[PDB]
């Protein structure tokens, strides 16, 4: 089959141990900027003392800098507030004496090399929020519920507004916030006012009233608005930062239900709407590019309370792929996969050489099911949720169960190399997995009940493995650490020695395992989303194909830190399949044509009344958001006003 030679040597000298002398309590880990190797470990003990370690070599060596934080006690509730991109900004929130006028923070703007102790004119209630546009601009909520803003990275603060419940950093240093008038935040629930500040407190605009909550998603601003002399509430959307608002074409909810943004981007949002009264499920809706028109995408979508378990996963290694869990009528849980951004959802293909477990009503015919957030929450034997990396094309790794529903059995690990069209059992039993060098290295740690001393690796995308002993003295494993972006060749194995417990981190560099750097010949041409290769339209997802250049499973070379995923789009001809029904239109049975509804019912009728001209004047069809098809079919429809078909039945005044 093929394996790596003299590998023990290549890794032996590349295995860097480091012990953590004083360690117990809340033990945090933080990476500081890309391509820096900066790791910040922070431990807190309760009698009192706080330990702070720093690295500059991808966690191979740490240098105790507890001295830099003037040997004070840090409140892990706030954690290490790290600055965007490579700003190098780090904020630590220290525990102060009960009497104190305000809180105290430690700030570094040089990747934790030098810290500034800074006392504050208030006590923080929230972690400090860095501005996306300006890393030197911060905002925070006082314990007294006041909005404070720093224009100089924590040095100088000023209470820009008082009675606030929630504040968010928008695009280009703009802030949005909910403001209560009466008692508290919990008292004015659905009575709050939504405000905006373009100039950091200098000017304000009340962009909302009778607000339950608000949130940002891609290009949209959503806000649940409470009904007048009514218990219910509904979503309203604003593409212009609160200047104009349109009602969303979504159902309304009572006080016992919630709305959740499952995923949002520049084209659309996946919106979860809770089903009425303690169901433990809801319905997924996909939006239009305006965030106004909504297409029902998935029924009985498993999502617990607002807080807040769902198996909703974006399969980041391949475009338009998402996986989630649905509740079956017999109260069993099934995994569903979408390949066209929730257009159509279906079961996952069962790994060819895998057996149908006890959950299957058929010995030979069934599907793969995935363990995610929910399995974990129900204390199942799941050490890790699915993992996909945008730089490792088509790779998905997850804990599975082959059958008709999610088994409670001890799961094995499964791998897909084509973004979830086809799967194969990667490893037997639970494991901790990580992707390195954009899929050049796959790493695995066994999830055992007893100490471990070995690590497994694959240079052919989990098709062939090679066990290596990182330590003579085994450890009780906790987790892995690798630099966000899956580009390093460095991995930190964490755990503790068998007791008299001492924490350790064995970091391994795979520089000598993958000595040769990849070249043109190591890459092959791969069409994503291929289904029927003899078809002109094969691979068309959202109107276009993407033909990639992918690393050969056989090739055992290094992509490098500077690797660019290379693809080539091919613009397909529009079919009606590239359009979704606009307001008031529907798709009968199997047919792909959009016919007008005989008569609007439910939340559709509500919108037909309480909505605006633009959205109701259709245009039987609308192009799927993010759909880039050209040519072919264009359903050229005269923009017909529908606020006649609703009012048609209602007797109306003069
Ligand atoms: C699902 O994940 C993908 C990949 O992370 C998101 O798309 C990427 O978004 C960035 C935004 O800057 C683009 O630069 C990339 O080109 C996108 N990659 C792909 C694979 O398309 C996507 O938006 C996520 N889905 C949702 C609905 O949020
Ligand atoms: C793994 O960690 C080492 C550090 O232990 C990284 O080494 C850095 O390499 C870049 C060039 O590749 C240099 O500019 C740095 O100065 C190096 N730092 C040190 C301390 O040697 C290495 O890049 C990491 N591996 C990957 C692929 O990210
Ligand atoms: C972000 C946005 C889409 C506007 C939204 C609206 C709702 C809701 O009224 O349920 N939620 C969930 C929620 C519930 C209670 C408190 C905060 C957030 N999120």
Swiss-Prot record:
Which controlled-vocabulary keywords does the entry list? Cell membrane, Cleavage on pair of basic residues, Developmental protein, Differentiation, Disulfide bond, Endocytosis, Endoplasmic reticulum, Endosome, Glycoprotein, Golgi apparatus, Lipoprotein, Lysosome, Membrane, Nucleus, Osteogenesis, Palmitate, Phosphoprotein, Receptor, Repeat, Signal, Transmembrane, Transmembrane helix, Transport
| Location of region: Interactions with LRPAP1 and NGFB | 518-654
Tell what triggers its expression: During osteoblast differentiation.
Residues with glycosylation annotation: 13, 70, 182, 314, 490, 590
Where in or outside the cell it occurs: the entry states:
Golgi apparatus, Golgi stack membrane; Endosome membrane; Endoplasmic reticulum membrane; Nucleus membrane
GO terms, molecular function? enzyme binding; nerve growth factor binding; nerve growth factor receptor activity; neurotensin receptor activity, non-G protein-coupled; retromer complex binding
Where is it found, in Gene Ontology cellular component terms?
Answer: cell surface; cerebellar climbing fiber to Purkinje cell synapse; clathrin-coated pit; clathrin-coated vesicle; cytoplasmic vesicle; cytosol; early endosome; endoplasmic reticulum membrane
Q: Where are the BNR repeats?
A: 53-64, 106-117, 148-159, 195-206, 236-247, 285-296, 336-347, 414-425, 456-467
What GO biological process terms does the UniProt entry carry, in alphabetical order? D-glucose import; endocytosis; endosome to lysosome transport; endosome transport via multivesicular body sorting pathway; extrinsic apoptotic signaling pathway via death domain receptors; G protein-coupled receptor signaling pathway; Golgi to endosome transport; Golgi to lysosome transport
Disulfide-bonded cysteine pairs: these are: 1-464, 165-185, 356-366, 518-557, 540-572, 574-629, 581-594, 608-646
Query: As annotated in Swiss-Prot or TrEMBL, what is the tissue specificity of this protein?
Result: Expressed in brain and prostate (at protein level). Expressed at high levels in brain, spinal cord, heart, skeletal muscle, thyroid, placenta and testis. Expressed at lower levels in lymphoid organs, kidney, colon and liver.
On modification after translation, the UniProt record reads:
The N-terminal propeptide is cleaved by furin and possibly other homologous proteases. Palmitoylated. Undergoes cysteine S-palmitoylation which promotes the partitioning of the receptor into an endosomal membrane subdomain where it can interact with the retromer cargo-selective complex which mediates its retrograde trafficking to the Golgi apparatus.
Side Extracellular, residues: 1-654
Membrane topology type: Single-pass type I membrane protein
* Subunit text: Interacts with LPL and SLC2A4. Interacts with the cytosolic adapter proteins GGA1 and GGA2. Interacts with numerous ligands including the receptor-associated protein LRPAP1/RAP, GM2A and NTS. Forms a complex with NGFR which binds specifically to the precursor forms of NGFB (proNGFB) and BDNF (proBDNF). Interacts with the Trk receptors NTRK1, NTRK2 and NTRK3; may regulate their anterograde axonal transport and signaling. Interacts with CLN5. Interacts with PSAP.
Function, as annotated, reads: Functions as a sorting receptor in the Golgi compartment and as a clearance receptor on the cell surface. Required for protein transport from the Golgi apparatus to the lysosomes by a pathway that is independent of the mannose-6-phosphate receptor (M6PR). Lysosomal proteins bind specifically to the receptor in the Golgi apparatus and the resulting receptor-ligand complex is transported to an acidic prelysosomal compartment where the low pH mediates the dissociation of the complex.
Q: Which family does it belong to?
A: Belongs to the VPS10-related sortilin family. SORT1 subfamily.
**Entry text on domains:** The N-terminal propeptide may facilitate precursor transport within the Golgi stack. Intrachain binding of the N-terminal propeptide and the extracellular domain may also inhibit premature ligand binding.
The record names the disease as: A common polymorphism located in a non-coding region between CELSR2 and PSRC1 alters a CEBP transcription factor binding site and is responsible for changes in hepatic expression of SORT1. Altered SORT1 expression in liver affects low density lipoprotein cholesterol levels in plasma and is associated with susceptibility to myocardial infarction.
The molecule here is called Sortilin
Encoded by which gene? SORT1
Q: Which residues of the full protein are shown?
A: 86 to 748 of 831
